[PDB]
Amino acid sequence: FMKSTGIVRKVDELGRVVIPIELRRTLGIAEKDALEIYVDDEKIILKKYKPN
Amino acid sequence: FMKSTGIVRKVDELGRVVIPIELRRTLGIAEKDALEIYVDDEKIILKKYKPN
């Protein structure tokens, strides 16, 4: 039922990954914005960060 | 509602995020390794990539 884009990127020296520009726009994320990171089932879940 | 590390990082110019070294080791990920990226519910799920 859940579909995944299935896109892979190479890991750079620091172990960082890049979001495709298509997701930068749809996720409303821009430079200097804050991301929050989750950990579940050996998978990493990243979402926009809106502190309350 | 799910439990997560709750750690946030700043977005750099290209819109990239960094995995904490604690997750680099636990996830078995190193430079030049391949990551596969998922998209669900406006959240990004990244997992180790096994070539097929």
From Swiss-Prot, chains A, B:
Every SpoVT-AbrB domain range: 6-51
Cystine crosslinks: none
One function term, GO molecular function aspect: DNA binding
GO biological process, one term: sporulation resulting in formation of a cellular spore
Coiled-coil intervals: none
Keywords: Activator, DNA-binding, Repressor, Sporulation, Transcription, Transcription regulation
Family named by the database record: To B.subtilis Abh and SpoVT.
The protein's role, per its UniProt record: Ambiactive repressor and activator of the transcription of genes expressed during the transition state between vegetative growth and the onset of stationary phase and sporulation. It controls the expression of genes spovG and tycA. AbrB binds to the tycA promoter region at two A- and T-rich sites, it may be the sole repressor of tycA transcription.
Quaternary context: Interacts with BrxC.
Name of this protein: Transition state regulatory protein AbrB
Organism encoding this protein: Bacillus subtilis (strain 168)
Taxonomic lineage of the native organism: Bacteria, Bacillati, Bacillota, Bacilli, Bacillales
Designated gene of the protein: abrB
Residues of the full protein shown: 2 to 53 of 96
